[PDB]
Amino acid sequence: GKLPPGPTPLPFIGNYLQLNTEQMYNSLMKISERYGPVFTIHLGPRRVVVLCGHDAVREALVDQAEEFSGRGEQATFDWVFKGYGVVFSNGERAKQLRRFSIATLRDFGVGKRGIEERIQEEAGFLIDALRGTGGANIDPTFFLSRTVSNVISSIVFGDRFDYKDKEFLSLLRMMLGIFQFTSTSTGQLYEMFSSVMKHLPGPQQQAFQLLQGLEDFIAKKVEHNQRTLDPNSPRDFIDSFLIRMQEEEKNPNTEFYLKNLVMTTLQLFIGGTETVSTTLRYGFLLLMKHPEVEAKVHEEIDRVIGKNRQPKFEDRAKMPYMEAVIHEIQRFGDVIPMSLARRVKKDTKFRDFFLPKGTEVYPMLGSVLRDPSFFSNPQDFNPQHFLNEKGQFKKSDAFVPFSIGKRNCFGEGLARMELFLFFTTVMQNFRLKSSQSPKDIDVSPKHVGFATIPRNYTMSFLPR
Numbered sequence: 001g002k003l004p005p006g007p008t009p010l011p012f013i014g015n016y017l018q019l020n021t022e023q024m025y026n027s028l029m030k031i032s033e034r035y036g037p038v039f040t041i042h043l044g045p046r047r048v049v050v051l052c053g054h055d056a057v058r059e060a061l062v063d064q065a066e067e068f069s070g071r072g073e074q075a076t077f078d079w080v081f082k083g084y085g086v087v088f089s090n091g092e093r094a095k096q097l098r099r100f101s102i103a104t105l106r107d108f109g110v111g112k113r114g115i116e117e118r119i120q121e122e123a124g125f126l127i128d129a130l131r132g133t134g135g136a137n138i139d140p141t142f143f144l145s146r147t148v149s150n151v152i153s154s155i156v157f158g159d160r161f162d163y164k165d166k167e168f169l170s171l172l173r174m175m176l177g178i179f180q181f182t183s184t185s186t187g188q189l190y191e192m193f194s195s196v197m198k199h200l201p202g203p204q205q206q207a208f209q210l211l212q213g214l215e216d217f218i219a220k221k222v223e224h225n226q227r228t229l230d231p232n233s234p235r236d237f238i239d240s241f242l243i244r245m246q247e248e249e250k251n252p253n254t255e256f257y258l259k260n261l262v263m264t265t266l267q268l269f270i271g272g273t274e275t276v277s278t279t280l281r282y283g284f285l286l287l288m289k290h291p292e293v294e295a296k297v298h299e300e301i302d303r304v305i306g307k308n309r310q311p312k313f314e315d316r317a318k319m320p321y322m323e324a325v326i327h328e329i330q331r332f333g334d335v336i337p338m339s340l341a342r343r344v345k346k347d348t349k350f351r352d353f354f355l356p357k358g359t360e361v362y363p364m365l366g367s368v369l370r371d372p373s374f375f376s377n378p379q380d381f382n383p384q385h386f387l388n389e390k391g392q393f394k395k396s397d398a399f400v401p402f403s404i405g406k407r408n409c410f411g412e413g414l415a416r417m418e419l420f421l422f423f424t425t426v427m428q429n430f431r432l433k434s435s436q437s438p439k440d441i442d443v444s445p446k447h448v449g450f451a452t453i454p455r456n457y458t459m460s461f462l463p464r
């Protein structure tokens, strides 16, 4: 009949004094040790119910999916989105935009041979670019993001960016900068005090300029499409949305208008780029750290695929080890540690607790990815967490990097195809040489807040 228990908050600052903005995950897990897997925390004035561990998260987001299907907030992103767009919208707006987005993504090849061919082709471009380095030590950050970003870019903008495109690099920097900021102490402090901070000088202002930069770019691309639009022959996601907008012009209450187009497109562009990119980057670092794992991956690739042909998505079924490795990378990486906030759609009764309608919820995906009840050694990187005795792939109900439930990631299909084809093709063609000794490679995160960011590093890609 009452909300989950938790530390007594103070007016306005909430539980700020009982938290550490540089390590929110750790702070909440600590409080969790005292109040239990389901507790209440006050992030500044924001009252939030925190769900820790697999059971609590699944019970809420899956067993009571409709009740927890609301979209919470992320102050930094809300600065530009203001509740528009598929990701941060709620109610009728979210229902229309999500349905349309999923359909439009599929119409443009997502989950089909079309997008697979697009990915294989861009993968071929990654290979060329890596060979272009001549085995020199480099920062793989943008090599990876350019390739990844061109996949979702092909869908939303009609086609790919040239790797030499300076505005392209510029946009990628904006995305990287935003994910970093939201994962820093100030970024997490902003989640608590955005009401005042959005108006104060500080790092947040610089972050805002990056978002503004992305919005301007999108608004620009949309204008260009508008003035070259063939109502019966859409080239991309944008044209599709524009056509829908024309069809809905006479509906006072349609959700299909310019702001939702711009924001939805911006969200998919960022969503489809930085998440996959960060994962690839963390993955290669993890493989250099564990030579024994790269060795096995090479054995499976050579046997199953060989050295001549391009790997294809169907090869995954014949490659249990690679599938286990990518899973372990996503589990260890814990890219979106606290997921994207949800909120109860209406008054809810959850585990003998009462959550009034509108209550914000923090599904601690990281605590699920490292639930000691589902993984033998959660803190270690070990592909075995995903293999049975005969070395066959073993799924886990605790594997939730894309979250679960009604507002789960609908980019998962695309993401998985990308992770498999990029990782495999790169490993088929190169062995990884780290700038330092494996024993010395630090795989602990550089930042953890909204996202998990790996430490900066360099490496070389040596031909096989």
Ligand code: HEM
Pocket: 071, 086, 087, 088, 098, 152, 267, 268, 271, 272, 273, 275, 276, 279, 335, 336, 339, 340, 341, 342, 401, 402, 403, 404, 405, 406, 407, 408, 409, 410, 411, 412, 414, 415
């Ligand atoms: C390895 C890559 C990715 C990870 C780890 C990931 C993770 C997430 C997570 C944790 C959520 C929130 C789920 C929830 O609220 O329950 C989410 C939502 C979302 N993701 Fe992803 N994602 C990835 C890639 C993608 C890609 C490639 C796209 C783009 C096609 C994308 C599109 C979205 C969208 C549009 C949402 C919002 C859905 C809604 O509000 O209904 N994601 N993602």
